[PDB]
């Protein structure tokens with residue numbers, strides 16, 4: 267499956283090189299520029315737990331997901347992961363708990379020590 271592949275071919279994009287956030291580019295975007303911290307960022311995404319019990323998509327709310335990069339509004343994996351993406355790119359991220367909800371989880375949405383998978387499309391990122 268898509269997350270297996272990420273375990274197998276995915277680039278470790280953490281600083282500590284702990285495999286906490288692995289990435290594969292699925293569709294190549296346009297341009298050299300990636301989002302800077304503080305940029306307003308627009309994405310579509312699909313997300314699930316590796317336990318396979320919960321799924322979630324932006325598409326369902328019929329609205330892009332908008333957040334400010336680096337401003338602590340998403341999990342660290344997103345701040346790290348979306349910083350690496352170009353306008354128009356689609357990527358897969360596999361994420362260990364330390365870059366997600368950790369040992370405490372976010373009960374009951376996210377259980378203790380959960381691993382997460384996302385497919386993310388970077389639509390646009392504007393400067394603050």
Ligand SMILES: COc1cc2cc(OC)c1OC/C=C/CCOC(=O)[C@@H]1CCCCN1C(=O)[C@H]2C1CCCCC1
Pocket residue numbers: 311313314315320321322331339340341344372375376382
């Ligand atoms: C749409 O509602 C949610 C989705 C997720 C988690 C939620 O909170 C536990 C949540 O409710 C409100 C919180 C939003 C920001 C935190 O969320 C994140 O930082 C990440 C990245 C941004 C998109 C959503 N995402 C999530 O972690 C999802 C989660 C949903 C369960 C399956 C795995 C992904």
